[PDB]
Amino acid sequence: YDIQAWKKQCEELLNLIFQCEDSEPFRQPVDLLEYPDYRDIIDTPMDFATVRETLEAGNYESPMELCKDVRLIFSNSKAYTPSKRSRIYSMSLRLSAFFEEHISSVLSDYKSALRFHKR
């Protein structure tokens, strides 16, 4: 029932994601010189360094907010992909499955702790 435990849990999950080779295209903001039309398709860029920095700045109130930004990394990859078989998009699908498998207990524990706090 620790209402604050999600933060270290998210730091550790981001550390695992940075170790994953599948995260390399998503570790820093997309390079507009490499993809000059990126902002014509993607309204809200997002990347894992921005997520980590937002967390470390104390600018996430809950793991749901972090999870919304990580899911935006994956939906941006899906929106920008020219093909469902592209290399970078395939890396995002595997990384998304890994992320969803690990974030589920973080979200459940947080929501349970908050419900206990408000009982």
Ligand X SMILES: CC(C)c1ncc(Cl)c(C(N)=O)n1
The residue ranges that bind ligand X (CB under 6 A) are 25, 30, 35, 77, 80-81, 86, 88-89
Q: With respect to ligand X, which residue has the nearer C-beta, 86 or 112?
A: 86
In the complex, the smallest distance separating the C-beta of residue 15 from ligand X, rounded to whole angstroms, is 21
∠ CA 70-3-45 to the nearest 5 degrees?
15
CA 77 to chain centre: 12
Longest dimension (CA), the chain: 52
Are 28 and 53 in contact, with CB atoms under 8 Å apart? Answer: no
CA-to-CA distance for 62 and 111, rounded, in angstroms? 9
In the complex, the smallest distance separating the C-beta of residue 87 from ligand X, rounded to whole angstroms, is 6
Q: With respect to ligand X, which residue has the nearer C-beta, 12 or 24?
A: 24
In the complex, the smallest distance separating the C-beta of residue 117 from ligand X, rounded to whole angstroms, is 39
Q: With respect to ligand X, which residue has the nearer C-beta, 74 or 110?
A: 74
Which contiguous run of DSSP H or E holds residue 68? helix 63-80
In the complex, the smallest distance separating the C-beta of residue 35 from ligand X, rounded to whole angstroms, is 5
